[PDB]
Amino acid sequence: NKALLAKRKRLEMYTKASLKTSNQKIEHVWKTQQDQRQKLNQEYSQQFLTLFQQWDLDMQKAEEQEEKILNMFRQQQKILQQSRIVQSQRLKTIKQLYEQFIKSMEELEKNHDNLLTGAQNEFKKEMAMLQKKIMMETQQQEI
Amino acid sequence: INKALLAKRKRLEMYTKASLKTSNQKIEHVWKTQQDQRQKLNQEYSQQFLTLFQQWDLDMQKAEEQEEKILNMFRQQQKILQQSRIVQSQRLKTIKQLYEQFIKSMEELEKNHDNLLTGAQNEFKKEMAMLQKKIMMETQQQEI
Amino acid sequence: VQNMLEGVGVDINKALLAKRKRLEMYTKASLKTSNQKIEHVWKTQQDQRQKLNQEYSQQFLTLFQQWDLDMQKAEEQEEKILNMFRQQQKILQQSRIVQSQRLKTIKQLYEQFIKSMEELEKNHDNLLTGAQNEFKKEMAMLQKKIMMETQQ
Amino acid sequence: NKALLAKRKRLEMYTKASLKTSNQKIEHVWKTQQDQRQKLNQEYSQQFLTLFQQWDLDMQKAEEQEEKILNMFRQQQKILQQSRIVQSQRLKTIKQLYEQFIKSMEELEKNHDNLLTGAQNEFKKEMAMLQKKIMMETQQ
């Protein structure tokens, strides 16, 4: 009976050990599956993170280049506006110079008119004197 | 005799006066003609220059209007370029957030599943232990 | 008497075989059931992971479809910007050609004006010469008349 | 009659000289006035020539600057275009990576199904051996 109980205890210990091992092997299958699902998620998350980081950097570069264009345009828009302003001033200058030219010609005409009248009056006196000389030197004297 | 001589003299003097008056008037008409032609020429060109200046002023008014349209067009194009960048950044944020939500939902599901699996595994262990205990008790030699 | 104990032994071995067969049948059935229950937990978990994937895939598909449509609209906007610019670029280059012509026109009219004044001066020189010569013929005729008539 | 002809010739010579002198003095007034009109034209022509030259140069620079703005616009139309192309590629890349991810998870599910089946079958063999051992040893 001591032998009987020793045999029973031996079989019970072996059963306990066998169940423990068989269950642990199944537990390792769950852990493997879980490891592989997490590994797959980590691999794709790294790839998505790389894409999102590259996209964010490209948007930062695009913002930087917009700033460069705005500055370039600001400068060129000022030069273009000034070149139009100068042309409008040029038109005003030519119109004013033309009016000045016409006015100078009118002032000169008035001066010339008065000088010509004086010269014409002298010419008339000279011609009258010439005819008076001819008349007096040819005319028959009174008897 | 002297009355006749003086009448002849008076006649010649009147003719001389009339001739000088006419000859001088003809020269005076040359001055007036020259003056007329110079003024006519100035008036003709002034009218032409005025037409050109008026047309030029209107064309400068149109050129300023069109210059404003093309600069506005560039500024409007910049608005489109800037907006498309802003929308892209929003899109990136939306996709990034949806991806993080997906990963988080999978992690939450894993935690729920872990607890459910532990419970099921414990029941399985009890059933296997019960099965082996049944085999042992039904086969074993009884105490004497 | 020994034959009896031996005959008892056969009935013992028959009983032993029957007991073993019964336990083997029960074990087979129990392992099958216990494994099936675990398999169902696995299938449930797998169903819920697939359901989650299907739900997110639908949401990602919506985002990608909306993005594709927005790129089609952006291509439409880009085409209108070009077309409005092409029209405006033509009007602007035409304006600049006209103002170039205006400078040429004014420069030519100015040169024509100066040349006309020079030509008029030359014509006026001939009108004065002609008038002075006519005056010189009239004075000679007048003197001839006075001379001839004062001798009479 | 010799005296009469001498007198006439003297008066004719004087008249010719007087008309010549009087006309020359008027001609000089005319030439002076003409000189002053010609001088005035030359002064203004110099000023107009300067303005026209400067205007021509300013129109050359205005043409070049307009060209720069039109060029700047054309360069941005290319950037807005290359923005649309890069976006479409980016969308394609993300969409493909997402589909790959979903497909990989489906493939993993199928592999995991086989790992569980295999483990369950090994477990069944282990329990059968264990029962056989208990049975054989409880009789001996």
Side-chain angles (χ1 to χ4, degrees):
Chain A
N1 213 263
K2 188 194 163 287
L4 179 63
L5 291 163
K7 185 183 194 190
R8 194 179 287 192
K9 192 194 178 182
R10 178 186 59 88
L11 290 174
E12 278 159 16
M13 289 313 264
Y14 183 73
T15 296
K16 199 177 187 158
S18 296
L19 285 167
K20 195 187 186 198
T21 306
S22 288
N23 286 125
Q24 190 49 57
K25 284 166 78 158
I26 292 286
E27 262 290 332
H28 188 67
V29 168
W30 304 132
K31 295 294 180 201
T32 294
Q33 295 179 340
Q34 185 188 340
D35 174 74
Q36 296 176 349
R37 279 194 302 271
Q38 291 171 357
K39 185 188 176 194
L40 188 62
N41 287 358
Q42 291 170 358
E43 282 173 352
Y44 279 89
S45 292
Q46 194 211 291
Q47 282 169 73
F48 277 102
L49 186 79
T50 296
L51 295 186
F52 300 147
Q53 271 174 1
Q54 190 56 69
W55 195 356
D56 206 349
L57 288 161
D58 288 341
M59 292 321 278
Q60 284 184 327
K61 275 182 188 175
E63 192 184 324
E64 279 178 59
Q65 295 168 284
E66 271 160 47
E67 293 306 315
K68 281 193 188 172
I69 279 303
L70 184 72
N71 303 334
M72 259 208 175
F73 176 79
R74 201 185 280 105
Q75 289 152 37
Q76 293 308 293
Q77 186 188 60
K78 279 177 185 197
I79 288 149
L80 189 75
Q81 271 173 350
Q82 240 212 254
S83 73
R84 180 193 52 83
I85 280 152
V86 166
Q87 271 205 86
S88 281
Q89 181 54 64
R90 208 146 284 278
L91 167 63
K92 205 193 169 183
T93 295
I94 288 146
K95 198 196 171 218
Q96 277 185 272
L97 193 63
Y98 187 71
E99 289 160 352
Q100 232 206 285
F101 186 27
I102 296 296
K103 230 184 93 184
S104 291
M105 281 176 83
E106 291 167 351
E107 291 175 333
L108 197 60
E109 201 67 88
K110 289 175 199 284
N111 287 338
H112 286 174
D113 207 304
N114 304 330
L115 284 166
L116 183 54
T117 299
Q120 188 69 13
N121 286 340
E122 275 316 301
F123 178 85
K124 283 189 224 181
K125 282 168 189 158
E126 285 153 31
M127 296 299 92
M129 280 182 75
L130 173 56
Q131 295 296 338
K132 178 178 171 280
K133 174 187 171 72
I134 296 152
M135 180 93 236
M136 288 188 93
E137 293 180 19
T138 53
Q139 77 184 8
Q140 205 216 121
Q141 305 303 313
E142 293 167 84
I143 299 150
Chain B
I1 295 146
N2 241 55
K3 191 192 163 175
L5 181 125
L6 292 157
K8 184 189 200 190
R9 197 179 282 188
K10 192 195 176 168
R11 178 186 56 89
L12 290 175
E13 279 159 15
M14 293 303 94
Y15 183 73
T16 296
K17 201 189 180 225
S19 295
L20 285 165
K21 194 190 180 191
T22 306
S23 291
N24 284 313
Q25 192 39 251
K26 284 167 73 172
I27 289 186
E28 262 291 333
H29 188 66
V30 167
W31 304 133
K32 295 296 181 206
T33 295
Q34 291 179 336
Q35 186 186 341
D36 174 76
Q37 296 176 348
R38 278 195 302 272
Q39 293 172 353
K40 181 190 176 171
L41 188 65
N42 288 356
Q43 294 170 356
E44 154 190 346
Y45 277 91
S46 291
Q47 196 213 291
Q48 282 170 73
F49 278 104
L50 183 84
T51 296
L52 295 187
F53 299 147
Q54 274 174 0
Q55 191 53 69
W56 211 330
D57 204 354
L58 290 161
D59 289 341
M60 288 225 79
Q61 189 181 72
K62 277 183 188 284
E64 189 184 323
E65 280 179 11
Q66 297 310 284
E67 197 193 74
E68 207 183 301
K69 279 191 185 184
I70 196 61
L71 295 161
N72 274 356
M73 269 212 73
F74 187 89
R75 276 168 66 167
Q76 286 163 339
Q77 192 192 41
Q78 286 317 289
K79 287 172 198 178
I80 287 142
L81 186 76
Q82 180 203 267
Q83 264 317 100
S84 74
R85 179 195 51 84
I86 282 151
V87 163
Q88 257 200 85
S89 280
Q90 183 55 66
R91 204 154 285 275
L92 164 60
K93 206 193 171 182
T94 294
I95 288 151
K96 200 190 172 225
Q97 278 184 275
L98 191 66
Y99 185 70
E100 288 160 351
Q101 233 160 78
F102 185 28
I103 296 296
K104 228 172 262 182
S105 293
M106 284 188 281
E107 291 167 352
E108 290 175 334
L109 196 58
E110 197 38 54
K111 290 176 199 123
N112 287 338
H113 285 173
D114 212 301
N115 299 329
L116 283 168
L117 187 50
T118 298
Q121 191 67 15
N122 286 339
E123 275 316 300
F124 179 87
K125 284 190 225 180
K126 281 169 66 197
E127 286 153 29
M128 296 299 95
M130 282 182 78
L131 174 53
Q132 293 302 335
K133 177 177 170 280
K134 171 186 182 66
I135 295 151
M136 179 93 70
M137 287 186 87
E138 295 180 21
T139 54
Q140 88 191 346
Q141 178 152 253
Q142 305 298 311
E143 286 159 87
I144 293 156
Chain C
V1 201
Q2 299 162 273
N3 302 352
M4 298 290 313
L5 205 79
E6 200 199 2
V8 150
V10 184
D11 275 335
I12 285 160
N13 239 59
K14 286 158 90 162
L16 180 59
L17 242 190
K19 186 189 261 195
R20 283 185 184 181
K21 191 200 163 81
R22 178 184 59 87
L23 289 175
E24 279 163 10
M25 283 192 164
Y26 184 75
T27 295
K28 198 191 169 173
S30 294
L31 285 166
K32 195 189 190 168
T33 304
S34 288
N35 283 314
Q36 190 50 57
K37 284 167 67 185
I38 286 289
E39 195 184 30
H40 186 244
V41 172
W42 169 247
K43 294 301 191 81
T44 297
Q45 291 195 359
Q46 186 173 76
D47 171 79
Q48 294 171 356
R49 278 195 302 273
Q50 288 283 306
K51 185 185 169 281
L52 191 63
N53 287 358
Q54 291 173 354
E55 283 170 355
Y56 278 89
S57 280
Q58 194 43 67
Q59 283 171 71
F60 278 100
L61 186 77
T62 295
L63 294 188
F64 301 146
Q65 271 174 3
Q66 190 51 251
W67 194 355
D68 205 348
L69 289 162
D70 288 341
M71 291 310 101
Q72 286 183 328
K73 277 183 190 284
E75 197 184 324
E76 287 184 61
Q77 293 175 333
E78 199 187 289
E79 202 175 290
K80 277 193 182 177
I81 300 153
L82 191 101
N83 268 27
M84 278 207 163
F85 173 81
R86 290 170 73 185
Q87 282 180 293
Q88 270 297 125
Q89 188 183 205
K90 280 170 180 161
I91 296 154
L92 188 78
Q93 276 167 26
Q94 156 83 75
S95 270
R96 175 194 47 83
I97 287 161
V98 156
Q99 273 216 31
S100 191
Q101 184 54 66
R102 293 286 188 274
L103 171 56
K104 209 193 167 183
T105 292
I106 191 164
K107 200 194 269 192
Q108 277 185 275
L109 193 67
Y110 186 71
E111 287 161 352
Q112 233 165 76
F113 186 28
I114 296 297
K115 229 176 263 179
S116 290
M117 284 187 283
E118 292 167 353
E119 289 176 335
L120 197 60
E121 284 303 359
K122 292 176 202 124
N123 285 340
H124 286 174
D125 280 336
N126 298 331
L127 278 168
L128 181 57
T129 302
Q132 283 190 322
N133 288 338
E134 265 221 299
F135 183 89
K136 282 158 144 149
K137 281 166 68 198
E138 285 152 32
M139 295 297 95
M141 283 182 312
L142 174 53
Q143 155 194 251
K144 178 177 174 277
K145 177 177 164 82
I146 296 154
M147 268 170 188
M148 288 183 154
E149 295 183 23
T150 51
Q151 295 322 302
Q152 291 175 346
Chain D
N1 238 56
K2 188 194 154 194
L4 175 64
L5 289 165
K7 185 190 233 188
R8 280 189 188 177
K9 194 198 168 81
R10 176 185 63 86
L11 288 176
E12 279 162 12
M13 283 197 280
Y14 185 75
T15 294
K16 198 188 137 203
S18 296
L19 286 165
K20 196 189 189 177
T21 304
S22 290
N23 284 312
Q24 192 46 61
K25 284 167 70 179
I26 287 289
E27 192 201 321
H28 188 245
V29 170
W30 164 241
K31 295 293 188 192
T32 297
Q33 294 192 359
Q34 182 170 76
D35 174 76
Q36 294 171 355
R37 280 190 302 272
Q38 283 170 357
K39 187 190 169 278
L40 190 63
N41 288 357
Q42 289 172 355
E43 284 171 356
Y44 278 90
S45 289
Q46 197 214 293
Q47 283 171 265
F48 278 101
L49 290 174
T50 296
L51 294 186
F52 300 147
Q53 273 174 1
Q54 285 302 295
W55 206 339
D56 205 350
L57 289 161
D58 288 340
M59 287 213 319
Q60 285 183 327
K61 279 216 163 288
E63 185 188 322
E64 289 146 0
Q65 297 307 289
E66 193 180 75
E67 169 252 312
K68 278 191 180 184
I69 286 271
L70 293 174
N71 219 52
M72 277 191 71
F73 192 110
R74 283 171 220 123
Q75 296 294 90
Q76 300 305 277
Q77 194 74 32
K78 289 168 184 173
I79 286 149
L80 183 75
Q81 186 180 51
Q82 188 69 85
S83 151
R84 187 188 54 82
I85 288 144
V86 159
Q87 264 203 81
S88 279
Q89 182 53 257
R90 193 146 261 158
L91 163 60
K92 250 171 223 163
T93 294
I94 287 151
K95 198 192 168 183
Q96 276 185 276
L97 194 64
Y98 185 73
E99 287 162 350
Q100 233 162 76
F101 185 26
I102 297 296
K103 229 184 92 175
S104 291
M105 285 189 276
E106 292 168 352
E107 291 175 334
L108 198 60
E109 283 304 359
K110 292 175 200 125
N111 285 339
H112 287 174
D113 278 331
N114 298 329
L115 280 168
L116 181 58
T117 300
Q120 281 190 323
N121 287 340
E122 275 316 299
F123 181 92
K124 284 188 218 188
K125 283 168 191 162
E126 293 171 352
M127 295 294 98
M129 265 165 67
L130 175 52
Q131 155 198 56
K132 179 173 176 73
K133 181 179 158 80
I134 295 154
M135 268 172 187
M136 289 186 91
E137 294 182 23
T138 49
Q139 237 48 58
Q140 267 221 304

